[PDB]
Structure formats: C-alpha cells, structure tokens
Design a protein around this nucleic acid. Structure first.
Lengths: 61, 345, 128, 91, 345, 64, 133
RNA sequence: CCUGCGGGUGCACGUCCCAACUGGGACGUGCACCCGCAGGAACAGCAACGGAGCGAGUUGCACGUCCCAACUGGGACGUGCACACUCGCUCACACAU
C-alpha cells in the first residue's frame, strides 16, 4: 500500500510515502495485518513471536 | 568491605525528619497528583470491598476494560466490535467512533461496562493521516500548502500539515486534527476544489482518538485473539492485561472528587453526591463541568456534573455537590451503608 | 549488495541462507517455475497447500512487514516437518521466479529434473 | 461392558509400544481408563496424560493383542463417558 | 570507614529490610525510639541462629528430611524445617529454617522453583532443533502425575531452555523454571514422549528456590559442620554468621509497612496493624496481599494481609491497615505500650 | 556424574556435560561432596582451606 | 598429547606440593614397581583414609585434578599431623595408568619394601626436599 | 425524584476459473449496516470484644568389620538417623502519644 512510516528517537511515528527513510532503513507499512476471525494459527504465532522476543508480554512497562 | 559496614553499622531509621511530603505524580490512572487535591476530611472507615483498577480479577477486568485496537483495513468498525465480542466472550461491546470500511487506525472498543462511556467519547478529539490524489497537476508544492492553510477552521480543523507530496504521481500525505463527526473525505474533496484541480482520497489512518494514540498501547486484532487463546489454554492473563486497559484510563483528563466508601453504593443507586461524603477534590471545578466520582482505590464510581465550585466545596458544610450523569460502577460492589448517619437517623 | 539487504530484513528471519546458499536457493526457484503445478507462490496458495499436507521446502522473504502476515507459517512448517529457510529480499524471489512483482514466499516440490539441486539445498538447510 | 462410548480424540504418533492420541474432548480421562474403538473394543488403558489444559494428549498401553502399528493416521479413539472428569476439577 | 555515619551511605545500600526505606511513603517521621530489639545482622549469636536460615546445597544420596535433622543435630537447635522437599537422589538448593524462622516455612511453599536436569532419549532424534522445539511446546500449564498419590495436578512451566545435547550419548541438559510442586521427572517422561523417542530423567539439580539461588550465599553441609566446630572449639562466630543468614532475607520481596516501636508488641499479641501506628508504607499494597510488618530497625514483626491499599492509607486517619497471618517476632521482645494513645480514655 | 559446569565473567553457572570448557580450562562437577554426619575432619579441612584461601570467611562478605 | 606444564595448570588451588616432572616420573616408576605386591599398595579414597586412620606409614600420592575438593581436602592435613610425606601428581589419569587399570584413582599409598627400597628412599627424600607451603 | 435495562450493500471463510502483504468471477456458509420493565428514594455512621502463640486428631540414609569382584556401585553382621477443619491450654482483647 501507499502509506509507510519510520521511527525517530522518541518512537514518534513519521509517515511518508518513501520506501527508504533518511536513515537508510526500509519504511514500515502503516497498516496492520488483515484479520480473519476464523484464524486457527494463534498457538503458532505465540510460539514464533516468543522465540524472537516480540510478544507484548515481553516488552518493558 | 561494604558487607562489613552493613554488619557493623547501626542502620536504623532516624527518629524524626519533620517533613512528610508525598510523591503521587507516579501513581496510576485517577490517583495521579493525589496529594495535590484539596483535602476536606480524612476521617472515614474504608470497606474491604472492591479492587484497584489495575489489579482486578480477570473477569471483572475484562468486564470493565477497553482496547485501543489497530483496525484492519477491510472491515467496518462494527464488524471489529462484533469480532471482539465473540473472541473475548463478553455480553456487550461497543465503541465510539465509526471508521470507514477501508480505513485503519485507533479504535476504542469498550467491553461490556465501559460501554456506558461510549456516549462521552463521541465528541472527543480525533486525528487522521490521509493520502490523497489530485485530478490535475498544480503549479508548485507551496500552492498546496497554502490550500491546506485555507481549510483550517470551521468548515472544524484545528491543525493541518503536508507531511509529504510527490509531484510525479500527484499524491501526498497530510496530518489533520478534527472534532468528532468530521468527514475527512469531504475535507479532501474541498481541498481539491480550493486547489482548482479537484481531488479524492485513497487512504486514511486515524492516529489518535481523544487521549488515545498510536504509542498508547495500541494492539492489533491478532493480539486480542492470541491473548484470549493464551488465557484459554495456558490460563495466563499477562497478555490479556497488556491488551485490555482499565476503563479509568479514559477518564484521566477529568477533574476528580473522591468520596467516602459509605457513599459509593448510594451513588450507584442514584443518590446525588452530597458534601457529607467528599474526601478530596481537584481544584478548578466550575459549575456545569464533567467530573468523575472516584473511590479512594482509584475506581470510577460515576460521571457527575458539578453544582459547586472548588471554593464553595471548600467553604460549605451541606448540600449537593454534583448530580449524576452515568453510574459506571455496578451496584452492590460495595455494601449499602446509606441511612446510618447522625443527621439522617 | 547482500549484507546490507540482510540487515534490512526482519528479526524473525532465522535461519538465514548465506550468499552462496541464496544463489543456490534462487537457482532452485528458477528451475522449479518451468513446471506449472510443482511450484506454489504467494501466501494463500502456499498456506492452503501446507494445510492440506503438501511436502517440499518452503522459502521466506524476510523483508516483510508487518510480520503478522507470516509469523505463524514458520511454526506450521516446524510442526509439519517441512524444511525451510529465509532469503534476503523479495525482489530476488520475484526476479528468480520470472515475475517483476516481488513474491513473499514459495514452496518447491520434488521433480526429477532438479533432483540434485533440490537435495543439495535440503541438506544445506538442515545444517543451519 | 461399555454401555456407551464417545469420541475421545484422534490419532497422534507412536512412542515404542505406546500410542499418543491427541485428545479433543475438554474432559480429562481417568488413569488406566479402558479406551475403546467405535464398536466398543477395548485396545488398552491410559498411562500418561500430558500437555496443556485444553490442547493435550493421552498415551495408551495396548495389551490385548492390538499393536501400535495396527492403527493409522486420522483414525479415532473412544472412551466411556463415565470415566471422565470436568476440566474445572483439575483446574 | 568503620565510624562513618549511617546517613553517609546511600539508602540503596541498607540491611535487608531497610533497602530504599526513603523510596517509601512517609506517613509520619515522629516516634519515640525504644531501647529493645536488635538490628537483624547485629543480633547476639544465641539469637542469630534461632532467627536465621540456611541455603544448603544438598548432598546426593540423603533425603531432605535427613538433611534437615542433620543440621538440627549439628547446631543443637530445637526445631528445623524446610520449604520444599528435594528427592533423595537430587542435589541443589534447600532453604532450611532454624527455630523461629520455621514460621516462614508455609509462606515459602508457593515460591517459584528452578531445576537443571539431564535426560536420556532411548532412540536417536534427528537434530537438536527437534529437541528445542519439543521443549518449546511443553510450556504453560501442564498436566502432571506424581511419580511412583495419583491425583493429576496442573503446574505451569514458565520457561525452559536447552543448554547442551550430546548426540553420541543421546543425553542432554535442560533448564526448567517451574511453579512449586512441579515434578521434573514427569516433565522428562512427557518430553521423551513428545519428541517421539522416549526418555527419562537421570540426574536433577535445583538451581533456585524462591528468591534464593546457587550464587546467593549457598553453603555445603561441610561448611555448617565446620562452622559449628569453629564455634564450639574456638569461639569464632564469623563462620556461623557467613553460613546462617537472618530470616529477614526470605522477605525482601514482600511489600513493607514500618510501624512504631510502640506498636511492635501489640502486633505480637495478635493485634491487627492499625493506621495510627504506621510510620511508612510501600506502594503497590492491594487488598488481600501479603506484606511484612517491619520495625524501625528492620526486624520482621509479622506477615500481615493488607486490608487497605496505598491510596487508602494515604487518605485515612485510623483503622485496620492489615490483619495478621503469621507473627514472627517473639512476644515481650518490645515493652507493652498499648493503651497510652493521645486519648487514653 | 554427568552434570558439570564452568563459570562465565559474571560467575554464573553454565551447565555442560562436556569435560573440557570453552576457554580450555576443565569443568567443575555440579554436585557437593558426599556428607557423613560422623565426620571428624573439620579441623583438617579448616586448616587446608585457610592455607589456600578457600574458607567462607575469607571470600569477600556478601552484599545483603 | 597434553603437555606437563599445561596439565599442572588444570589442578586445583590446593594441589601443592606438586611433584616436578622428573619427580613425577620417579613417582610413576615407584607406583608401577610396588604394584607387584598386592598387599603393599593401598588404592581408593576410603581405603587410604582407613589406613591413614589406622596409622599406616608410607608415602601418599594424590591427584591434582579433583573436584570438588571437599572429598579429599582433609587428607592433606591428616598426613601432616601423622608425619606421612605426600605430593600431588599432575593428573589422575596418570596414576591410573601407573597402576595400569585405566580407571584413575584419586590417591595411592606406597609402602616400603626390599624390592624397591632405593626408589622409595629416593622419592621420599625428594618429596621432603620439595617442601610444604 | 434519581438511576439502570430494553423497544440488499459490505466483510470473513471453504471450494473451482482464469488472467504481491492483490485486485476479478461463481458457488455455498456464516457476521455487520440499510414508551415498557426494575432498584432506590440515599445529608454518607462505626478510634477494638475475635486475633495470636503452643500441643493432639481428621524403605532409604551414614558409621564400623568383613567377602569379593574411580568421588563407585553389591552382600552379610551390629549400630544410630528420616519416613483445609476439629479439639484442648495460655496471652492479651491492643486506634500505638
């Protein structure tokens, strides 16, 4: 899709149609994953996300 | 070594310091800046009933929470609300702002008892970030910037800013703030007309709904589903406590009046919030102002409208201090202890 | 280059094929497109096939965001015992599949035309 | 002897002379509970109930002639309704 | 230096129940100090043993009860207990309470344990990735049967991590964090089943029992023997103090409530903590929570269940701050000074 | 017995079944020395440990 | 093959006095020679401990590579009290090889005999000359 | 009087057609949008007569002496070691200057 964004020091979201932020990294697409209520892959999402420490429970605060 | 000093040193609290200031700026939710509230009376008998907002049991927590959800692109907001109702297995669920089917962003979904606060959120501020395309090219970027500057007012649009603009594709992205009920597609077509070439939207992303924003614990629908599954298999609610947030978080911008634990169930059953049960209050209360009645545990008893200025509440000994607008506390969370007073008897 | 691309990938992109393994993995994709039904491309078809029980080696492109679209498929592969590995970027998958459009993930079955490269890539993956 | 039988769950894998049978019904079977087939045929008893509290497994010890290999993927295994517990009891 | 004033050391370095005593909420600095009681780490030796505990790296063969009775026989104490039973062939931490500290045995049962086991898989698995995944799927609340009652129980395995796998011997090691009561023999049996090969536990070693671990003043039984030998034959109390630690170290994780020297004896006689006697209370106190009442010297008066939260104590002038659950300090340690309040009517 | 360990920079017990450790030095067994209550060798142990600096009172005091 | 200098560094901080290389050869030769008579060499922790308890004179040999030390750290001071010379050997496997049983022993007790009087004398004097820390 | 409660469009899925984290069609499932009732009538009481401490009920291990065939595992002979409620007694019944 069109919109993307990149993070400044504060974690403040900086929206931009650019595919590359001024810092050289790629630009994260603003939009979340399309959701299906009849999704049975939740166990596998927790398993994988936990391996790489991306789960909500694993962040500070 | 320091261990030797620990084993040989007195290390006892000093007999006196003469100062007992509290640092309440870091207490959660409606107890922030607690000591700065005007203190009317500290004489009262707390009851063992009721929990603190953040430390409720899981059932009562889900029953009185809200989710700042990142809405997926495709569905209609009411679909998201139905989905959350199904997943969390909660009787009632609603929301304040209805985002268009093809929109994404903040969407405050209230769960089964914060649904009494949806009416109050319908007027709350809102922010967006839109991508738009123009039918024909314009002279320069400054023409667009000026065009945006002419649509900053009662059309309301509190602020606006051209975050990006690509002249090759004639597509740019701008950030807008608007009062609730504003249709940003109308604003974009109006900006197109003002620019003299016309325009229409392609994308939109709500970036704040009131005091709730992108970095304020916004969570995807996947997080909701995973939280429910983790709680329904591992019997773990750390996920479901990160996802849901106590409904007191939406009332943190209101002035507070704390009340005795003996007037809580009276207010639940409708009684007006009379002075004889006000322990503390926030300076700056003006007649006809929305305030929140809070127990001393941080619980949002209700939403009332003030009939007494801060000064009057400081300098008066009887009378009604507020009339109720919405009883957010469920009845019988505290015992019925109205009618045992000295004057009443 | 290649190292900068790997830096550009996501944190869940592990195991990761080296440059040489990437060249071999991409040769496999190119040699597999030749036959219509022996290469599955795109999220939906690959996922439906994995659910059905198709076998082979899955390949992922680690430059995808939000990972929520494919953060569950690595674990489906592990459960179903299908070798897999990520690759630095999507535009290589697209270019190596005969499509300028980038392709997030694929699934290469076994055909005697490319048996040797298939087994070689499988062995190299199992040693990572 | 089994007055009735209900579907405990479908087949898993094999561990030496044991057959792990992915249990489906939320209820937790009895230890050494005779597991029957569709036609009320006891093949063994339960030995090891392991896993989480809603998606778990239950091993069986085939003694009366039946072997682990005799069964095959997808096949279904049954149990007496009276030899179950409510998921809340253990929880 | 030895004679440096107590205040000259930053409050983040005080002894074991005073650590960060200023980071607490100061209800009043004013109290008359009394000349009784001792600082936990400065007690006389005859009372240090009676009010202490040990962290015994258990030997291989003997049972846990045998180890506890052995310490009782060496130290010539009147009573000794332990807060988690380690199998006869299982090594690792074991918290042994001496005399008065046995009252904290029950409070330590529900502490989170940790083990490091060794498991041998009958057949051969393909790759250590299989075994890592197998450990991954065995997490959260798990069904577990006590090894050869037969009542199934559900205990959670908060974490697990494979440290070593050695394919030729088909044996490896994995570190498991578990709730109290977890049987790791059963965990190994289930894990062997899950990998599809079979397996069993051939060696176990506890690595932490609550807040105490192998790097937290753990000592072998030879050290207790030699400490007692030093005390009897040389009159050297250094070894016995290194080996035995005060019971206040088992309660560093409990939210604290300091009380005046006047109230310390009332609590010992069954009195409930009352707000007038509170000098300092710690944030995060919730209804029905276990907290530790502490004298101004850091001694542990009792374990009490909070009946008022931090916000309530901050807004009241009397009442019951906490009910009692297990009084630790002996009676008449402090003088009887109850009945002499500002009214005393 | 199987379980051995080697210490890292933080002095954290790193458990390995290998007889040799990563840096090259050997691995210390993970089990305490067998204890018999009728042990009449306390004086000798004290003497040796004091000689080589291994007694508990000689290591730096803890930080409770 | 493991060197002798590096092999010594692997011993515990209690493994002193540590027989130098030449003395170590002399200690291996002695143990091999004494093996001939079954009842003139003790082997094993319990056995050596029992005999040192029962007042049996001779020269005891330990293994520098021992862990934990609290299974044999009391024997050094029992030998000092009872006036039995002793020295630690670079590693246990060497003593095991000296006996030729492939199962390394932590310690050994070599007594005196006519057959190896000169060697037993040569080694005892060298150990005494080594010195105790 | 106050309160609470009620009064053909799109989307997701599975299966097939063809010509990205997709747009297109069809078939079927599903989900979303196009005054009455009840509670109370409240001026917000309660600075100790139920809490604590004790007592009772609801085979292996280590030593030594021996037999033998690593910090061992084995045998025998003797040693010592561990395997929530109710009922009683006592204390005060405490708002902590």
């Amino acid at each position: 899709m069109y919109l993307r964004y990149y993070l400044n020091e504060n974690g403040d979201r900086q929206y931009t149609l650019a595919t590359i932020d001024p810092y050289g990294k790629p630009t994260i697409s603003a939009h979340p994953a399309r959701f299906s209520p009849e999704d049975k892959y939740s166990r596998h999402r927790i398993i994988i996300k936990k391996r790489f420490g991306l789960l909500l429970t694993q962040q500070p605060e | 070594s320091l261990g030797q000093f620990q084993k040989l040193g007195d290390f006892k609290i000093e007999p006196t310091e003469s100062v007992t200031k509290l640092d309440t700026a870091y207490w959660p939710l409606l107890l922030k800046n607690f000591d700065r509230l005007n203190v009317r009376t500290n004489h009262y008998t707390p009851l063992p009933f009721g929990h603190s907002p953040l430390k409720r049991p899981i059932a009562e927590y889900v029953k009185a929470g809200f989710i700042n959800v990142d809405k997926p692109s495709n569905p209609s907001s009411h679909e998201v609300v139905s989905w959350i109702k199904r997943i969390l297995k909660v009787e009632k669920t609603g929301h304040s702002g209805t985002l268009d089917p093809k929109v994404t962003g903040c969407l405050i979904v209230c769960i089964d008892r914060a649904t009494r606060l949806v009416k109050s959120q319908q007027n709350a501020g809102k922010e967006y970030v839109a991508v738009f395309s123009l039918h024909s090219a314009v002279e320069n970027v400054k023409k667009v910037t000026q065009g945006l500057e002419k649509l900053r007012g009662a059309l309301s649009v509190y602020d606006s800013k051209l975050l990006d603009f690509d002249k090759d594709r004639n597509i740019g992205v701008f950030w807008v703030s608007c009062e609730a009920g504003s249709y940003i597609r109308t604003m974009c077509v109006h900006l197109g007309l003002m620019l003299g070439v016309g325009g229409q939207m392609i994308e939109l992303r709500r970036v704040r709904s009131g005091i709730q924003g992108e970095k304020e614990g916004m969570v995807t629908m996947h997080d909701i589903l995973d939280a429910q599954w983790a709680y329904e298999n591992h019997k773990d609610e750390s996920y479901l406590r990160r996802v849901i947030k106590p409904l007191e978080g939406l009332l943190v911008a209101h002035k507070r009046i704390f009340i005795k634990d003996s007037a809580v169930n009276a207010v639940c059953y409708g009684a007006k919030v009379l002075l004889p049960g006000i322990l503390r209050y926030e300076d700056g209360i003006e007649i006809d102002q929305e305030i929140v009645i809070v127990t001393t545990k941080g619980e949002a008893v209700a939403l009332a409208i003030a009939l007494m200025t801060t000064s009057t509440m400081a300098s008066c000994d009887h009378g009604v201090a507020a009339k109720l607008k919405r009883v957010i506390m469920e009845r019988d969370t505290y015992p019925r202890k109205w009618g045992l007073g000295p004057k009443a008897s | 280059s290649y190292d900068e691309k790997v830096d550009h990938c996501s944190v869940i992109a592990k195991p990761m094929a080296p440059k040489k393994l990437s060249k071999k993995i991409y040769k496999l994709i190119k040699k597999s497109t030749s036959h219509k039904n022996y290469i599955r491309n795109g999220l939906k078809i690959v996922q439906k096939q994995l659910r059905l029980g198709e076998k082979g080696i899955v390949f992922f492109a680690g430059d995808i965001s939000p990972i929520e679209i494919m953060c569950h498929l690595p674990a489906v592969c592990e459960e179903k015992d299908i070798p897999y590995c990520y690759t630095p970027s999507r535009k290589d998958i697209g270019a190596a599949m005969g499509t300028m459009r980038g392709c997030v993930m694929v699934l290469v079955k076994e055909h005697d035309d490319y048996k040797d490269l298939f087994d070689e890539v499988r062995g190299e993956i199992k040693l990572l | 002897p089994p007055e009735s039988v209900i579907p405990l769950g479908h087949y898993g894998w094999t561990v030496q002379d044991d057959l792990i049978c992915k249990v489906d019904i939320e209820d937790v079977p009895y230890f050494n509970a005779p597991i029957f087939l569709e036609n009320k045929e006891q093949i063994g008893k339960i030995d090891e109930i392991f896993g989480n509290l809603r998606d778990y497994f239950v091993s069986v010890k085939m003694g009366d002639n039946f072997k682990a290999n005799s069964f095959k993927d997808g096949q279904q295994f049954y149990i007496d309704p009276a030899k179950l517990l409510p998921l809340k009891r253990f929880l």
